Subunit: 387 residues, 4 copies
Amino acid sequence: NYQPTPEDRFTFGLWTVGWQGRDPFGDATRRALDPVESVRRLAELGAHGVTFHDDDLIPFGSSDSEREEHVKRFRQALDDTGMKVPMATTNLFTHPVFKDGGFTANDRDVRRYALRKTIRNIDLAVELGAETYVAWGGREGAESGGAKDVRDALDRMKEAFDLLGEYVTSQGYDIRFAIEPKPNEPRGDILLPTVGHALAFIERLERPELYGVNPEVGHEQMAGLNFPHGIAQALWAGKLFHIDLNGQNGIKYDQDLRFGAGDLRAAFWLVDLLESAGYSGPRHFDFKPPRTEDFDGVWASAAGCMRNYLILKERAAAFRADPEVQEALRASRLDELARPTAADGLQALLDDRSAFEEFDVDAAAARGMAFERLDQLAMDHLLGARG
Amino acid sequence: NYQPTPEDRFTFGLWTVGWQGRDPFGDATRRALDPVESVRRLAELGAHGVTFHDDDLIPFGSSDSEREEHVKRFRQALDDTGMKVPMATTNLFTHPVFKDGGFTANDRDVRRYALRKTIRNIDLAVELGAETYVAWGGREGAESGGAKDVRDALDRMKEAFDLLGEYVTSQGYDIRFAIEPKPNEPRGDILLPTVGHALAFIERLERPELYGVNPEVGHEQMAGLNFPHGIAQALWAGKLFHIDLNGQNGIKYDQDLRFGAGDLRAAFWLVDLLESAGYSGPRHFDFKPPRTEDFDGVWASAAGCMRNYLILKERAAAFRADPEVQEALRASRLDELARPTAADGLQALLDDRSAFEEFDVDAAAARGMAFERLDQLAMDHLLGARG
Amino acid sequence: NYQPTPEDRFTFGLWTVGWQGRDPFGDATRRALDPVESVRRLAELGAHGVTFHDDDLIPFGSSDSEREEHVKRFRQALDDTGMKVPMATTNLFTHPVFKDGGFTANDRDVRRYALRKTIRNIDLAVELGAETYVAWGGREGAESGGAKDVRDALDRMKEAFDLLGEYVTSQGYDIRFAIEPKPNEPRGDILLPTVGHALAFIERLERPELYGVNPEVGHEQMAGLNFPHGIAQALWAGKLFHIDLNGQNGIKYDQDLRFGAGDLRAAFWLVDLLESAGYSGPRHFDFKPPRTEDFDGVWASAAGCMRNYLILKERAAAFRADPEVQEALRASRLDELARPTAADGLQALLDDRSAFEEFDVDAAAARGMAFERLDQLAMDHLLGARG
Amino acid sequence: NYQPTPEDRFTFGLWTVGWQGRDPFGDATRRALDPVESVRRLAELGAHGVTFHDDDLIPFGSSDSEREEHVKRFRQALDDTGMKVPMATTNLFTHPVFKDGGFTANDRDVRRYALRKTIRNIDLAVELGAETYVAWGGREGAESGGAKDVRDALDRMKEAFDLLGEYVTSQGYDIRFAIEPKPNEPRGDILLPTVGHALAFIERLERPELYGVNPEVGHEQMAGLNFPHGIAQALWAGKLFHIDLNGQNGIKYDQDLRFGAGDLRAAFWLVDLLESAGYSGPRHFDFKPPRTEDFDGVWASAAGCMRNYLILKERAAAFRADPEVQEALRASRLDELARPTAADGLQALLDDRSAFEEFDVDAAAARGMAFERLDQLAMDHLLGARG
Ligand SMILES: [Ca+2]
Ligand SMILES: [Ca+2]
Ligand SMILES: [Ca+2]
Ligand SMILES: [Ca+2]
Ligand SMILES: [Mg+2]
Ligand SMILES: [Mg+2]
Ligand SMILES: [Mg+2]
Ligand SMILES: [Mg+2]
């Protein structure tokens, strides 16, 4: 049961299944993977495609002839399997040159290098068929208050994203950008730390229509926020261009557990919302198989990501379709929430004595919301315990 | 030393010094205060003014003749002392009718009542001279996933704020709105949970120029966020209309400690930023004297709010003016952060071999940022330990 | 399905279903309940019994004749229903006299009053048949560093618990004590903030055998801790005398959601551990029906507590009994974890070349733990998705 | 001013100043340091000594002749400078063999290897003059619930520590053990996650007198706990054998900032407590110079650790010595906190009508604690703002 197929649009970063297991306190526990092997093994599990940072596909420092050969071998693996590349991104965080940032480094020469490195990889992403170009500014931020003037850094961030938008327009590319928030780690505090901050920033760009968000489950949860609520605001804004799916157990280091692990009920409400809203983009997993695992465990963890999405999709659809749930939603006035407050207009509201002078506040206050019965029907559906 | 005067623009809510000490587990520890007594005692400490919820000034349910008398006595106290009223707000959270929200209650009749209650108090706020009208939607949100469709709630929130903007325009009022974020408490999750989310929402209103933020120190810190960074983004956007100052010790219930308490270094960097940016609005305290205190302790805690702001203002100004600090800022390339990345333009950047083909990445990576020396100069200034 | 009966040992505090809905920002949303009505309604849902604070059963300040009548009516309700009283406790936190603590108040006269108030209620608890007497020191702690010398406070805490142990021994009572940790709320920091701190403190009492812990799900989770791990340590120590079951969504104010809500996977692992260990005490719920609810919603939320325990008990038992899970546990070396490291003794270990000189560290490191496959079998069992 | 000397007992791990800057998302930013150079540079800053993991001093895998030469060169550097080695520890976390733990690995052969590796380094630690042997079980724990039976793991942990105590007794060594808690990172949850849990565990060892704690500032703060409160409980128990000093900004990844950074007021209250209690052990720093820094910045950050301790020591001593503070402490009844509750005994307390029957609860409740005035005197002392 719950078998994934390419039509489900599940995708994985090369760096996910390829993670060698180096952590803040430990050496690698697995050998490096050839990208060709990852494309083949993910296709065998029912994935739709893969994503990459520049430096995952082409080792940093490669000659032009070595670059050509790495791309040629990867394209053959895509052609052998039917796998797609819907998204790509730039590594602006591993190399020591990026220790104070890429686009917002205090050193101007590093900012210019970061833009040239990104532009080179936008060309490659378009050649491989990507629709979305992600930016995770993991080095943009500070450990101390004097190190980074945040207004100046936001000016540099806007300048960078405006130049990238000029570039893609000049080349006639159809690709769009997606900014990925994170609140902290590896910097003490990261700029644009949540979905809200990234959405607000985009409204100051010269061409806002070219930019949206790539929210990650565990990143919003590292600020103790409700991930489904933040996704709802992104959808409300028309800005959910891509998503990163994984798990996280509360406020700690970025765990990148397989999807479904961590906050299981939040995963349920997330899938319910994506499916109800008709989100059509990739279901992308940004996860780390724990370093306890061998290669067999890597593929088991990847398979589990897709399995858990499909279980949750079934249970959320059954919840929404149940006539007893539909009655409970009316008892809780979810239908009234979706009606305008005052389609009669401001003057009519001011002249309505039933809205103030003759409003029975005590009778309204006495009416229970019936939310606990609704939520226990949701629990029963998630757990397969309906009686 | 560090004596406040009205020119410092320190203001306090009636509900701050007037808090009777009821908490989630305990009864009141202090008698109610007459607003007239609070105006008098705050003026004697060097405050500039006071703010109010409707129901702090006029007991809920008052007749028109009782309302007139409560306002008359308050206006006499303002006239007796020279105290101002720069901000007012609505209580859309105490009465049981608001148990599922005001503007985003699932019950439509409660949404309409919430708007009429707000409009009545906007008229009073203008009569008393307020420049800013705050909205804290403390009941807007949920404990469970099915109870609140967040896209529908955001539609109702926008409708409410658009009607309020229509109202103030129709009356020719000069007053502006400020939305106050909070991530949780009293709801399990609150809508518009951070500065970023509120800034993004405002860009979808019909008249965005009429709306800004009222960020509170402790509320951003309840999400583990950097409060100075969020203030910098609000300033970058042109949206810092008002601020709430207090203290908070990390991720827990909303403590509302006196300003300076909680995260002392964050308080330093906050004052540094407000003063460097030339923020001109009220320095408003939203705090609770702990319920351990008697009335003498209430006034001691209020005095401490203002004293700590003035100490931090002195130390931040000395830091920025120190020639050794100015040299350290250049050593750390803060001057280069404020210069454009590519004022030469996109084509020049693409044709610059020094930005990619001939960029010496290893020499750039070897250059230390000197941030620890800069931060220890900042510590020495805060603590009065310069040698 | 999943119907509770008295034999399941589910119990509820009077103050749970009786919570009127006053929160840090809002007035009551429900009328007070007569304890007689709560005993009757809980019995009808399949509960085993009820628990009380002194002041829940007898209003504070009652005459001796009023006290007798309140106890008489309650005893009749217990006799009418077959309901038991396995635990009682003291309210040392609501009345303003306890604003700086009961047993660790800085005022000595308040410490002595707190002990007399507790002793009176121990006599009543024994008369009603309680086996456990809980202490939650919610007011013991501080908002500021100078207010409370913690070594002195721990001396006063030990003196109090030693006097209570002397009292119960002198009367020949069989009752035992259980200390309930909480990290914060209503104090900025509470003394004995976790299970570990309470276990360590007990080892310094004169009669340690008389004292154990009453851990609460949401309280350990307010420190971001793993509740099942802390329960395992309490069991290891022989000190799990009682437990409080509820839900919590991470690091925030104390939510007291119904059991099963909050961290669902942690609830699964908790039930697995209680059942595997043969815990025999009450399954007690310390929860708040949200203030959105009317009386029908109160009883629905109470019913849901018991239903979720029974669903999780079924799924955990099926996991442990599955032969495929038993094979996965051996593949992950859980059997080897339970074997002694060196039953051969220290000298044999020192003389064993296979433990150092001839140990093949690279072959051992290459062996995968197979934990992801084991955890996805656990997920499949929880969700009723086994194929 | 604030110049450290060896008599201040400041010590540093080799791995602190020697950290090359590899983080969860980035490569090294600094070359490796020779231990001889670190001993020399730290002595020049006024340090007292250094500490080491086995593998910091002797590269993993070294021949016996290479081991002898590494120790010989290090001993010469100690003799050249007068530097001491008061503490050492084992690296049971970097090598991939320890991916599921050392003492609590599910694989028995790894548990035995972990003990042999520790014993070899205890012999070396004694040869170099160490008084304390630290254990940080950073790999002991789990990412998932089925992977680790915590009762079985605690049995293996006790067996390991009991064997180490047998070993040191058999050799007639005077060295004692100190367990270092951490709540998470690199495991999803770590066993013995706080000071309380470690203190409780020690009471179950065969020879409890041989074991205490090594608490770290940032580790307790990763659980949102009050570090000074936890130190007070360790001191109350007689178990503060050693301490790790650093900074942390709330609930996130382990930052290991220089001491004084992070929560500055908590650092003040910590130093106040260590000095008031007469703690006599090393003032050890476990910190990371941020990877933004070059070698000059490494030594600046190390110097800042010691400077901040000495500033805070001065301010705390001035607070406690101020007659106005001494009067405020009496006004707040800190003197009464230190007096027994009932030195008259249980029967006298029961017969005292002033403790219950004739206790005026309303007069006691009306008495303010005066804690805000006391705390603003503490703020004024910290900031050098006394008027
Ligand atoms: Ca992540
Ligand atoms: Ca607040
Ligand atoms: Ca609770
Ligand atoms: Ca650390
Ligand atoms: Mg991601
Ligand atoms: Mg506020
Ligand atoms: Mg409880
Ligand atoms: Mg340490």
